[PDB]
Amino acid sequence: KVLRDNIQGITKPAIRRLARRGGVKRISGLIYEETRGVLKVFLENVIRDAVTYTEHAKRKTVTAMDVVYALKRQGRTLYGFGG
Amino acid sequence: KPHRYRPGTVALREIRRYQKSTELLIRKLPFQRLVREIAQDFKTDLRFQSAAIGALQEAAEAFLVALFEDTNLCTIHAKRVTIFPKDIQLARRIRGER
Amino acid sequence: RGSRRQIQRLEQLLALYVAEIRRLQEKELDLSELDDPDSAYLQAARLKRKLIRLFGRLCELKDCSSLTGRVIEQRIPYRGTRYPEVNRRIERLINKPGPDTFPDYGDVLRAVEKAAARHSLGLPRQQLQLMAQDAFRDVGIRLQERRHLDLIYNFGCHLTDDYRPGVDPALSDPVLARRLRENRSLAMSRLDEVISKYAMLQDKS
């Protein structure tokens, strides 16, 4: 009944260590896919804002500055940065 | 009080950021490939400054870790428990955001 | 004391590493480059590692510690219980060095129990549990704060070092602001949706 998911990308040990860094020592099977999914959604959110800025500047390259302005709009993670 | 080394040619604020970069947990090649995977869905002609990929990774790992910190802080049992999706969700409702 | 000449040579190399890192940070990567194991991003990461190793070697050469002034190097005091032995054990627990220091409730409860048993404090089980819960809450807040400050005080690079929120283009372009507001509604729903999706999957098992 138990099954091992295939992937290319973010390994189980990395996700284990990310959870551990937050103090969580034991995670269920669904947490691995969930962590990958949450990571992807967060990145899409940031990149969507970043690209909105890039396009507003009439550029084809997303800059670190675009990413900063985007990150500031995503809540607590980068709250307070820059001033 | 431990003695502190302050290089004459490079500011410690630069050193600290490089050090943090070495502390990241997601392998950098898969991370940059995940960014590629997302960018492909927006626009095939988007380029990214390398530094933008770095900022993304530093922030994304902080975001994930904070999800786990919040779950951790809401989990109070005498015997340790395995964390499930519902625990993440609940903790996010209790002390998380939005 | 270390050789002045060798220190000067190594510091020159350190600065050379910095210049190359900055050059690589400004490289613009297309989609094929984001798929490349030898991209500017990965070259930059390798140089950062080399540089940090060299920094450590210079610390050893000048007989200094390897500290860099990180916020997570700052000690968090704990004096929350009426038992200084317990307080000491908790403070040791939360101040272990490195980026992984963040106990769970079990770790704090174990610290309290061990302190109590070691110093024969005679504290009953439920008193220990309450003491541990109050402690865990208190230190959780401070640990999160220290990490947050460590992040925002040490983020980005030279390209972002002049950022200030008052220069945000959205402040003076309402079409842009409107699109970002739309994006924000979507972003919050998308995050809710993934969290709820995995909760729902748990429900089916």
Side-chain angles (χ1 to χ4, degrees), chain A residues 20 25, chain B residues 80, chain C residues 75-76 78 86-88 90-97 100-112 135-136 139 143 146:
Chain A
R20 182 57 172 100
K25 284 139 94 109
Chain B
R80 250 176 213 95
Chain C
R75 196 170 175 90
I76 300 166
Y78 186 77
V86 173
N87 295 338
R88 275 187 225 115
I90 288 162
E91 185 171 317
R92 283 179 228 126
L93 181 68
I94 66 189
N95 291 293
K96 293 170 170 168
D100 294 293
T101 306
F102 207 112
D104 60 11
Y105 171 69
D107 294 324
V108 177
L109 172 63
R110 183 187 133 111
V112 177
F136 184 47
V139 308
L143 288 158
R146 189 177 57 181

PDB file of all heavy atoms in Angstrom, chain A residues 20 25, chain B residues 80, chain C residues 75-76 78 86-97 100-112 135-136 139 143 146, unseen atoms left out:
ATOM      1  N   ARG A  20      13.422  20.750  10.195  1.00  0.00           N
ATOM      2  CA  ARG A  20      14.247  20.691  11.404  1.00  0.00           C
ATOM      3  C   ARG A  20      14.733  22.076  11.850  1.00  0.00           C
ATOM      4  O   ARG A  20      14.768  22.381  13.048  1.00  0.00           O
ATOM      5  CB  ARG A  20      15.434  19.747  11.196  1.00  0.00           C
ATOM      6  CG  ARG A  20      16.328  19.573  12.413  1.00  0.00           C
ATOM      7  CD  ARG A  20      15.538  19.075  13.616  1.00  0.00           C
ATOM      8  NE  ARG A  20      16.402  18.729  14.749  1.00  0.00           N
ATOM      9  CZ  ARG A  20      16.617  19.514  15.802  1.00  0.00           C
ATOM     10  NH1 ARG A  20      16.026  20.700  15.878  1.00  0.00           N
ATOM     11  NH2 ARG A  20      17.418  19.109  16.782  1.00  0.00           N
ATOM     12  N   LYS A  25      10.724  18.002  14.011  1.00  0.00           N
ATOM     13  CA  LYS A  25      11.626  16.857  13.894  1.00  0.00           C
ATOM     14  C   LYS A  25      11.025  15.656  13.173  1.00  0.00           C
ATOM     15  O   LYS A  25      11.746  14.749  12.761  1.00  0.00           O
ATOM     16  CB  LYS A  25      12.135  16.446  15.279  1.00  0.00           C
ATOM     17  CG  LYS A  25      13.215  17.373  15.818  1.00  0.00           C
ATOM     18  CD  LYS A  25      13.033  17.657  17.294  1.00  0.00           C
ATOM     19  CE  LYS A  25      13.837  16.731  18.170  1.00  0.00           C
ATOM     20  NZ  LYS A  25      14.974  17.460  18.800  1.00  0.00           N
TER      21      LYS A  25
ATOM     22  N   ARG B  80       6.368  13.232  21.592  1.00  0.00           N
ATOM     23  CA  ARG B  80       6.497  13.875  20.289  1.00  0.00           C
ATOM     24  C   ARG B  80       5.510  13.324  19.264  1.00  0.00           C
ATOM     25  O   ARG B  80       5.181  12.139  19.270  1.00  0.00           O
ATOM     26  CB  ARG B  80       7.934  13.779  19.769  1.00  0.00           C
ATOM     27  CG  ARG B  80       8.648  15.119  19.771  1.00  0.00           C
ATOM     28  CD  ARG B  80      10.107  15.007  19.355  1.00  0.00           C
ATOM     29  NE  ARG B  80      10.915  16.000  20.059  1.00  0.00           N
ATOM     30  CZ  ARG B  80      11.584  15.759  21.182  1.00  0.00           C
ATOM     31  NH1 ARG B  80      11.558  14.546  21.722  1.00  0.00           N
ATOM     32  NH2 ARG B  80      12.285  16.727  21.759  1.00  0.00           N
TER      33      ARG B  80
ATOM     34  N   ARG C  75      23.427  36.662  22.083  1.00  0.00           N
ATOM     35  CA  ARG C  75      22.855  35.737  23.045  1.00  0.00           C
ATOM     36  C   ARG C  75      21.475  36.216  23.477  1.00  0.00           C
ATOM     37  O   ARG C  75      21.279  37.402  23.756  1.00  0.00           O
ATOM     38  CB  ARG C  75      23.785  35.608  24.258  1.00  0.00           C
ATOM     39  CG  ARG C  75      23.499  34.413  25.147  1.00  0.00           C
ATOM     40  CD  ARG C  75      24.603  34.233  26.176  1.00  0.00           C
ATOM     41  NE  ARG C  75      24.301  33.164  27.124  1.00  0.00           N
ATOM     42  CZ  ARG C  75      24.636  31.888  26.948  1.00  0.00           C
ATOM     43  NH1 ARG C  75      25.290  31.516  25.855  1.00  0.00           N
ATOM     44  NH2 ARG C  75      24.316  30.987  27.870  1.00  0.00           N
ATOM     45  N   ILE C  76      20.514  35.299  23.522  1.00  0.00           N
ATOM     46  CA  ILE C  76      19.205  35.609  24.090  1.00  0.00           C
ATOM     47  C   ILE C  76      19.179  35.198  25.555  1.00  0.00           C
ATOM     48  O   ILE C  76      19.349  34.019  25.879  1.00  0.00           O
ATOM     49  CB  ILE C  76      18.073  34.872  23.351  1.00  0.00           C
ATOM     50  CG1 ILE C  76      18.050  35.279  21.869  1.00  0.00           C
ATOM     51  CG2 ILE C  76      16.737  35.161  24.007  1.00  0.00           C
ATOM     52  CD1 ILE C  76      17.210  34.370  21.005  1.00  0.00           C
ATOM     53  N   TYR C  78      17.567  34.246  29.178  1.00  0.00           N
ATOM     54  CA  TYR C  78      16.316  33.762  29.741  1.00  0.00           C
ATOM     55  C   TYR C  78      16.413  33.721  31.251  1.00  0.00           C
ATOM     56  O   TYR C  78      17.283  33.049  31.805  1.00  0.00           O
ATOM     57  CB  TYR C  78      15.915  32.383  29.205  1.00  0.00           C
ATOM     58  CG  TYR C  78      14.547  31.964  29.701  1.00  0.00           C
ATOM     59  CD1 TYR C  78      13.395  32.501  29.141  1.00  0.00           C
ATOM     60  CD2 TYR C  78      14.406  31.054  30.746  1.00  0.00           C
ATOM     61  CE1 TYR C  78      12.138  32.139  29.595  1.00  0.00           C
ATOM     62  CE2 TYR C  78      13.146  30.687  31.211  1.00  0.00           C
ATOM     63  CZ  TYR C  78      12.017  31.233  30.626  1.00  0.00           C
ATOM     64  OH  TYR C  78      10.758  30.887  31.073  1.00  0.00           O
ATOM     65  N   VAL C  86      17.140  26.108  36.179  1.00  0.00           N
ATOM     66  CA  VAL C  86      16.288  25.907  35.018  1.00  0.00           C
ATOM     67  C   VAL C  86      16.568  26.990  33.988  1.00  0.00           C
ATOM     68  O   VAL C  86      16.826  26.689  32.818  1.00  0.00           O
ATOM     69  CB  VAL C  86      14.788  25.924  35.412  1.00  0.00           C
ATOM     70  CG1 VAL C  86      13.906  25.881  34.167  1.00  0.00           C
ATOM     71  CG2 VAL C  86      14.476  24.760  36.349  1.00  0.00           C
ATOM     72  N   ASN C  87      16.533  28.248  34.431  1.00  0.00           N
ATOM     73  CA  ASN C  87      16.811  29.395  33.557  1.00  0.00           C
ATOM     74  C   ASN C  87      18.122  29.217  32.775  1.00  0.00           C
ATOM     75  O   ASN C  87      18.161  29.415  31.556  1.00  0.00           O
ATOM     76  CB  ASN C  87      16.832  30.696  34.381  1.00  0.00           C
ATOM     77  CG  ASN C  87      15.470  31.030  34.973  1.00  0.00           C
ATOM     78  OD1 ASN C  87      14.444  30.566  34.475  1.00  0.00           O
ATOM     79  ND2 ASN C  87      15.452  31.833  36.040  1.00  0.00           N
ATOM     80  N   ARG C  88      19.175  28.812  33.485  1.00  0.00           N
ATOM     81  CA  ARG C  88      20.481  28.536  32.877  1.00  0.00           C
ATOM     82  C   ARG C  88      20.391  27.483  31.791  1.00  0.00           C
ATOM     83  O   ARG C  88      20.934  27.663  30.699  1.00  0.00           O
ATOM     84  CB  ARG C  88      21.476  28.036  33.929  1.00  0.00           C
ATOM     85  CG  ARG C  88      22.194  29.117  34.702  1.00  0.00           C
ATOM     86  CD  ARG C  88      23.282  28.519  35.590  1.00  0.00           C
ATOM     87  NE  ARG C  88      23.248  29.111  36.922  1.00  0.00           N
ATOM     88  CZ  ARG C  88      22.952  28.446  38.035  1.00  0.00           C
ATOM     89  NH1 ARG C  88      22.689  27.147  37.991  1.00  0.00           N
ATOM     90  NH2 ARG C  88      22.936  29.083  39.196  1.00  0.00           N
ATOM     91  N   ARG C  89      19.728  26.370  32.102  1.00  0.00           N
ATOM     92  CA  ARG C  89      19.619  25.279  31.134  1.00  0.00           C
ATOM     93  C   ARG C  89      18.859  25.698  29.866  1.00  0.00           C
ATOM     94  O   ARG C  89      19.260  25.357  28.741  1.00  0.00           O
ATOM     95  CB  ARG C  89      18.978  24.045  31.773  1.00  0.00           C
ATOM     96  CG  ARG C  89      19.515  22.723  31.237  1.00  0.00           C
ATOM     97  N   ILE C  90      17.775  26.452  30.043  1.00  0.00           N
ATOM     98  CA  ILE C  90      17.012  26.961  28.899  1.00  0.00           C
ATOM     99  C   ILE C  90      17.834  27.930  28.040  1.00  0.00           C
ATOM    100  O   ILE C  90      17.846  27.853  26.791  1.00  0.00           O
ATOM    101  CB  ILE C  90      15.692  27.635  29.369  1.00  0.00           C
ATOM    102  CG1 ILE C  90      14.711  26.563  29.853  1.00  0.00           C
ATOM    103  CG2 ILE C  90      15.079  28.464  28.244  1.00  0.00           C
ATOM    104  CD1 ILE C  90      13.576  27.102  30.716  1.00  0.00           C
ATOM    105  N   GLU C  91      18.546  28.827  28.715  1.00  0.00           N
ATOM    106  CA  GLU C  91      19.393  29.798  28.025  1.00  0.00           C
ATOM    107  C   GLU C  91      20.516  29.113  27.229  1.00  0.00           C
ATOM    108  O   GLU C  91      20.842  29.534  26.114  1.00  0.00           O
ATOM    109  CB  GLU C  91      19.950  30.819  29.024  1.00  0.00           C
ATOM    110  CG  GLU C  91      20.755  31.940  28.389  1.00  0.00           C
ATOM    111  CD  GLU C  91      21.104  33.038  29.383  1.00  0.00           C
ATOM    112  OE1 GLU C  91      20.219  33.413  30.183  1.00  0.00           O
ATOM    113  OE2 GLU C  91      22.260  33.526  29.360  1.00  0.00           O
ATOM    114  N   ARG C  92      21.102  28.056  27.788  1.00  0.00           N
ATOM    115  CA  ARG C  92      22.068  27.254  27.025  1.00  0.00           C
ATOM    116  C   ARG C  92      21.410  26.606  25.811  1.00  0.00           C
ATOM    117  O   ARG C  92      21.975  26.608  24.715  1.00  0.00           O
ATOM    118  CB  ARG C  92      22.700  26.163  27.896  1.00  0.00           C
ATOM    119  CG  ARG C  92      23.767  26.657  28.856  1.00  0.00           C
ATOM    120  CD  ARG C  92      24.320  25.513  29.711  1.00  0.00           C
ATOM    121  NE  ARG C  92      24.370  25.872  31.128  1.00  0.00           N
ATOM    122  CZ  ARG C  92      23.816  25.160  32.106  1.00  0.00           C
ATOM    123  NH1 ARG C  92      23.173  24.033  31.834  1.00  0.00           N
ATOM    124  NH2 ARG C  92      23.911  25.574  33.362  1.00  0.00           N
ATOM    125  N   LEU C  93      20.216  26.051  26.013  1.00  0.00           N
ATOM    126  CA  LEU C  93      19.479  25.398  24.931  1.00  0.00           C
ATOM    127  C   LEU C  93      19.247  26.316  23.726  1.00  0.00           C
ATOM    128  O   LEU C  93      19.478  25.924  22.578  1.00  0.00           O
ATOM    129  CB  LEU C  93      18.134  24.865  25.452  1.00  0.00           C
ATOM    130  CG  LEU C  93      17.237  24.116  24.458  1.00  0.00           C
ATOM    131  CD1 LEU C  93      17.856  22.777  24.058  1.00  0.00           C
ATOM    132  CD2 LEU C  93      15.843  23.915  25.034  1.00  0.00           C
ATOM    133  N   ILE C  94      18.796  27.540  23.986  1.00  0.00           N
ATOM    134  CA  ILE C  94      18.444  28.450  22.894  1.00  0.00           C
ATOM    135  C   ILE C  94      19.612  29.208  22.279  1.00  0.00           C
ATOM    136  O   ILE C  94      19.440  29.898  21.272  1.00  0.00           O
ATOM    137  CB  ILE C  94      17.379  29.471  23.330  1.00  0.00           C
ATOM    138  CG1 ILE C  94      17.950  30.403  24.398  1.00  0.00           C
ATOM    139  CG2 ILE C  94      16.144  28.754  23.833  1.00  0.00           C
ATOM    140  CD1 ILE C  94      16.913  31.308  25.033  1.00  0.00           C
ATOM    141  N   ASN C  95      20.795  29.098  22.876  1.00  0.00           N
ATOM    142  CA  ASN C  95      21.954  29.834  22.365  1.00  0.00           C
ATOM    143  C   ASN C  95      23.079  28.984  21.761  1.00  0.00           C
ATOM    144  O   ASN C  95      24.194  29.476  21.557  1.00  0.00           O
ATOM    145  CB  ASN C  95      22.504  30.784  23.439  1.00  0.00           C
ATOM    146  CG  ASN C  95      21.563  31.942  23.716  1.00  0.00           C
ATOM    147  OD1 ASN C  95      21.356  32.802  22.857  1.00  0.00           O
ATOM    148  ND2 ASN C  95      20.990  31.970  24.910  1.00  0.00           N
ATOM    149  N   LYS C  96      22.794  27.716  21.475  1.00  0.00           N
ATOM    150  CA  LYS C  96      23.717  26.901  20.682  1.00  0.00           C
ATOM    151  C   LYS C  96      23.974  27.598  19.351  1.00  0.00           C
ATOM    152  O   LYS C  96      23.044  28.105  18.735  1.00  0.00           O
ATOM    153  CB  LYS C  96      23.116  25.514  20.437  1.00  0.00           C
ATOM    154  CG  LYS C  96      22.964  24.665  21.682  1.00  0.00           C
ATOM    155  CD  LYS C  96      22.149  23.410  21.398  1.00  0.00           C
ATOM    156  CE  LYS C  96      22.194  22.439  22.567  1.00  0.00           C
ATOM    157  NZ  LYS C  96      21.196  21.342  22.440  1.00  0.00           N
ATOM    158  N   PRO C  97      25.237  27.627  18.896  1.00  0.00           N
ATOM    159  CA  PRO C  97      25.544  28.399  17.690  1.00  0.00           C
ATOM    160  C   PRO C  97      25.023  27.762  16.400  1.00  0.00           C
ATOM    161  O   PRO C  97      24.743  26.562  16.348  1.00  0.00           O
ATOM    162  CB  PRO C  97      27.080  28.419  17.671  1.00  0.00           C
ATOM    163  CG  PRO C  97      27.479  27.219  18.456  1.00  0.00           C
ATOM    164  CD  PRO C  97      26.449  27.074  19.525  1.00  0.00           C
ATOM    165  N   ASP C 100      20.612  26.444  12.874  1.00  0.00           N
ATOM    166  CA  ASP C 100      19.609  25.409  13.114  1.00  0.00           C
ATOM    167  C   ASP C 100      19.046  25.428  14.529  1.00  0.00           C
ATOM    168  O   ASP C 100      18.219  24.587  14.886  1.00  0.00           O
ATOM    169  CB  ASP C 100      20.182  24.027  12.798  1.00  0.00           C
ATOM    170  CG  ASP C 100      20.487  23.850  11.327  1.00  0.00           C
ATOM    171  OD1 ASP C 100      19.530  23.828  10.524  1.00  0.00           O
ATOM    172  OD2 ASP C 100      21.679  23.730  10.969  1.00  0.00           O
ATOM    173  N   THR C 101      19.487  26.386  15.334  1.00  0.00           N
ATOM    174  CA  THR C 101      19.064  26.442  16.730  1.00  0.00           C
ATOM    175  C   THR C 101      17.610  26.917  16.884  1.00  0.00           C
ATOM    176  O   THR C 101      17.296  28.098  16.701  1.00  0.00           O
ATOM    177  CB  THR C 101      20.010  27.325  17.559  1.00  0.00           C
ATOM    178  OG1 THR C 101      21.353  26.863  17.382  1.00  0.00           O
ATOM    179  CG2 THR C 101      19.647  27.268  19.040  1.00  0.00           C
ATOM    180  N   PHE C 102      16.731  25.969  17.202  1.00  0.00           N
ATOM    181  CA  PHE C 102      15.316  26.238  17.444  1.00  0.00           C
ATOM    182  C   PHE C 102      14.702  24.980  18.045  1.00  0.00           C
ATOM    183  O   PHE C 102      14.376  24.037  17.325  1.00  0.00           O
ATOM    184  CB  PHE C 102      14.595  26.614  16.140  1.00  0.00           C
ATOM    185  CG  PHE C 102      13.385  27.498  16.348  1.00  0.00           C
ATOM    186  CD1 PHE C 102      13.388  28.817  15.913  1.00  0.00           C
ATOM    187  CD2 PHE C 102      12.257  27.016  16.996  1.00  0.00           C
ATOM    188  CE1 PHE C 102      12.281  29.634  16.115  1.00  0.00           C
ATOM    189  CE2 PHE C 102      11.153  27.827  17.199  1.00  0.00           C
ATOM    190  CZ  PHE C 102      11.165  29.135  16.752  1.00  0.00           C
ATOM    191  N   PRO C 103      14.557  24.950  19.373  1.00  0.00           N
ATOM    192  CA  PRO C 103      14.075  23.727  20.024  1.00  0.00           C
ATOM    193  C   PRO C 103      12.585  23.506  19.769  1.00  0.00           C
ATOM    194  O   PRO C 103      11.895  24.451  19.369  1.00  0.00           O
ATOM    195  CB  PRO C 103      14.314  24.019  21.510  1.00  0.00           C
ATOM    196  CG  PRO C 103      14.134  25.509  21.615  1.00  0.00           C
ATOM    197  CD  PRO C 103      14.707  26.070  20.321  1.00  0.00           C
ATOM    198  N   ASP C 104      12.094  22.287  19.982  1.00  0.00           N
ATOM    199  CA  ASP C 104      10.647  22.076  20.061  1.00  0.00           C
ATOM    200  C   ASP C 104      10.217  22.035  21.526  1.00  0.00           C
ATOM    201  O   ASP C 104      11.067  22.113  22.415  1.00  0.00           O
ATOM    202  CB  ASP C 104      10.197  20.824  19.285  1.00  0.00           C
ATOM    203  CG  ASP C 104      10.836  19.538  19.788  1.00  0.00           C
ATOM    204  OD1 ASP C 104      11.470  19.532  20.863  1.00  0.00           O
ATOM    205  OD2 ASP C 104      10.682  18.509  19.099  1.00  0.00           O
ATOM    206  N   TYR C 105       8.911  21.931  21.783  1.00  0.00           N
ATOM    207  CA  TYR C 105       8.423  21.879  23.160  1.00  0.00           C
ATOM    208  C   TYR C 105       9.111  20.774  23.950  1.00  0.00           C
ATOM    209  O   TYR C 105       9.479  20.970  25.102  1.00  0.00           O
ATOM    210  CB  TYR C 105       6.902  21.693  23.230  1.00  0.00           C
ATOM    211  CG  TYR C 105       6.406  21.427  24.640  1.00  0.00           C
ATOM    212  CD1 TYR C 105       6.451  22.422  25.611  1.00  0.00           C
ATOM    213  CD2 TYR C 105       5.910  20.179  25.006  1.00  0.00           C
ATOM    214  CE1 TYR C 105       6.005  22.187  26.910  1.00  0.00           C
ATOM    215  CE2 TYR C 105       5.463  19.932  26.310  1.00  0.00           C
ATOM    216  CZ  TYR C 105       5.511  20.943  27.250  1.00  0.00           C
ATOM    217  OH  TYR C 105       5.068  20.710  28.531  1.00  0.00           O
ATOM    218  N   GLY C 106       9.287  19.618  23.318  1.00  0.00           N
ATOM    219  CA  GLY C 106       9.953  18.497  23.954  1.00  0.00           C
ATOM    220  C   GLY C 106      11.352  18.817  24.450  1.00  0.00           C
ATOM    221  O   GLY C 106      11.745  18.367  25.528  1.00  0.00           O
ATOM    222  N   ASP C 107      12.106  19.588  23.669  1.00  0.00           N
ATOM    223  CA  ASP C 107      13.473  19.967  24.042  1.00  0.00           C
ATOM    224  C   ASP C 107      13.452  20.865  25.283  1.00  0.00           C
ATOM    225  O   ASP C 107      14.249  20.696  26.210  1.00  0.00           O
ATOM    226  CB  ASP C 107      14.156  20.712  22.890  1.00  0.00           C
ATOM    227  CG  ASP C 107      14.386  19.839  21.672  1.00  0.00           C
ATOM    228  OD1 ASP C 107      14.675  18.634  21.837  1.00  0.00           O
ATOM    229  OD2 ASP C 107      14.291  20.367  20.540  1.00  0.00           O
ATOM    230  N   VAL C 108      12.530  21.822  25.296  1.00  0.00           N
ATOM    231  CA  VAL C 108      12.413  22.714  26.443  1.00  0.00           C
ATOM    232  C   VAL C 108      11.971  21.962  27.700  1.00  0.00           C
ATOM    233  O   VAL C 108      12.529  22.155  28.787  1.00  0.00           O
ATOM    234  CB  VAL C 108      11.464  23.886  26.149  1.00  0.00           C
ATOM    235  CG1 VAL C 108      11.304  24.759  27.390  1.00  0.00           C
ATOM    236  CG2 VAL C 108      11.991  24.691  24.959  1.00  0.00           C
ATOM    237  N   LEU C 109      10.967  21.107  27.549  1.00  0.00           N
ATOM    238  CA  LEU C 109      10.478  20.288  28.660  1.00  0.00           C
ATOM    239  C   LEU C 109      11.581  19.376  29.194  1.00  0.00           C
ATOM    240  O   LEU C 109      11.701  19.170  30.401  1.00  0.00           O
ATOM    241  CB  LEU C 109       9.268  19.452  28.224  1.00  0.00           C
ATOM    242  CG  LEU C 109       8.763  18.407  29.224  1.00  0.00           C
ATOM    243  CD1 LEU C 109       8.272  19.069  30.499  1.00  0.00           C
ATOM    244  CD2 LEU C 109       7.674  17.531  28.612  1.00  0.00           C
ATOM    245  N   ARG C 110      12.394  18.840  28.292  1.00  0.00           N
ATOM    246  CA  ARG C 110      13.507  17.990  28.692  1.00  0.00           C
ATOM    247  C   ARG C 110      14.555  18.791  29.458  1.00  0.00           C
ATOM    248  O   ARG C 110      15.117  18.299  30.435  1.00  0.00           O
ATOM    249  CB  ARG C 110      14.139  17.285  27.488  1.00  0.00           C
ATOM    250  CG  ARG C 110      15.267  16.330  27.854  1.00  0.00           C
ATOM    251  CD  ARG C 110      15.972  15.793  26.611  1.00  0.00           C
ATOM    252  NE  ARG C 110      17.428  15.871  26.729  1.00  0.00           N
ATOM    253  CZ  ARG C 110      18.235  14.821  26.844  1.00  0.00           C
ATOM    254  NH1 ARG C 110      17.740  13.590  26.847  1.00  0.00           N
ATOM    255  NH2 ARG C 110      19.546  15.004  26.946  1.00  0.00           N
ATOM    256  N   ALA C 111      14.808  20.024  29.021  1.00  0.00           N
ATOM    257  CA  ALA C 111      15.748  20.903  29.717  1.00  0.00           C
ATOM    258  C   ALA C 111      15.262  21.213  31.135  1.00  0.00           C
ATOM    259  O   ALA C 111      16.038  21.155  32.095  1.00  0.00           O
ATOM    260  CB  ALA C 111      15.960  22.191  28.941  1.00  0.00           C
ATOM    261  N   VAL C 112      13.978  21.534  31.260  1.00  0.00           N
ATOM    262  CA  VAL C 112      13.398  21.797  32.572  1.00  0.00           C
ATOM    263  C   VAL C 112      13.471  20.565  33.476  1.00  0.00           C
ATOM    264  O   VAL C 112      13.906  20.661  34.629  1.00  0.00           O
ATOM    265  CB  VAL C 112      11.943  22.321  32.464  1.00  0.00           C
ATOM    266  CG1 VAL C 112      11.345  22.509  33.831  1.00  0.00           C
ATOM    267  CG2 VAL C 112      11.921  23.637  31.707  1.00  0.00           C
ATOM    268  N   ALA C 135       7.992  28.911  29.198  1.00  0.00           N
ATOM    269  CA  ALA C 135       9.334  29.113  28.662  1.00  0.00           C
ATOM    270  C   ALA C 135       9.380  29.004  27.138  1.00  0.00           C
ATOM    271  O   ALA C 135       9.916  29.878  26.469  1.00  0.00           O
ATOM    272  CB  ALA C 135      10.317  28.125  29.284  1.00  0.00           C
ATOM    273  N   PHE C 136       8.827  27.918  26.609  1.00  0.00           N
ATOM    274  CA  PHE C 136       8.803  27.643  25.173  1.00  0.00           C
ATOM    275  C   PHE C 136       8.165  28.803  24.424  1.00  0.00           C
ATOM    276  O   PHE C 136       8.681  29.239  23.390  1.00  0.00           O
ATOM    277  CB  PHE C 136       8.033  26.347  24.905  1.00  0.00           C
ATOM    278  CG  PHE C 136       8.029  25.912  23.457  1.00  0.00           C
ATOM    279  CD1 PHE C 136       9.197  25.901  22.711  1.00  0.00           C
ATOM    280  CD2 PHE C 136       6.852  25.474  22.858  1.00  0.00           C
ATOM    281  CE1 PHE C 136       9.189  25.485  21.379  1.00  0.00           C
ATOM    282  CE2 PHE C 136       6.840  25.047  21.530  1.00  0.00           C
ATOM    283  CZ  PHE C 136       8.012  25.054  20.795  1.00  0.00           C
ATOM    284  N   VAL C 139      10.666  31.979  24.643  1.00  0.00           N
ATOM    285  CA  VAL C 139      11.868  31.888  23.822  1.00  0.00           C
ATOM    286  C   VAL C 139      11.549  31.748  22.331  1.00  0.00           C
ATOM    287  O   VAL C 139      12.344  32.159  21.490  1.00  0.00           O
ATOM    288  CB  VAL C 139      12.839  30.774  24.281  1.00  0.00           C
ATOM    289  CG1 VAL C 139      13.143  30.910  25.770  1.00  0.00           C
ATOM    290  CG2 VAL C 139      12.288  29.387  23.951  1.00  0.00           C
ATOM    291  N   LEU C 143      13.555  33.848  19.500  1.00  0.00           N
ATOM    292  CA  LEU C 143      14.283  33.129  18.459  1.00  0.00           C
ATOM    293  C   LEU C 143      13.823  33.562  17.065  1.00  0.00           C
ATOM    294  O   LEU C 143      14.648  33.757  16.142  1.00  0.00           O
ATOM    295  CB  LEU C 143      14.083  31.623  18.627  1.00  0.00           C
ATOM    296  CG  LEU C 143      14.801  30.997  19.819  1.00  0.00           C
ATOM    297  CD1 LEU C 143      14.134  29.684  20.191  1.00  0.00           C
ATOM    298  CD2 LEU C 143      16.259  30.788  19.494  1.00  0.00           C
ATOM    299  N   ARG C 146      15.193  37.107  16.417  1.00  0.00           N
ATOM    300  CA  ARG C 146      16.624  37.105  16.099  1.00  0.00           C
ATOM    301  C   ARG C 146      16.867  36.626  14.666  1.00  0.00           C
ATOM    302  O   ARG C 146      17.694  37.203  13.928  1.00  0.00           O
ATOM    303  CB  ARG C 146      17.419  36.270  17.129  1.00  0.00           C
ATOM    304  CG  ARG C 146      18.946  36.385  17.009  1.00  0.00           C
ATOM    305  CD  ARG C 146      19.689  35.605  18.083  1.00  0.00           C
ATOM    306  NE  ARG C 146      19.322  34.191  18.085  1.00  0.00           N
ATOM    307  CZ  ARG C 146      19.805  33.290  18.934  1.00  0.00           C
ATOM    308  NH1 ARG C 146      20.686  33.649  19.858  1.00  0.00           N
ATOM    309  NH2 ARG C 146      19.400  32.028  18.859  1.00  0.00           N
TER     310      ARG C 146
END
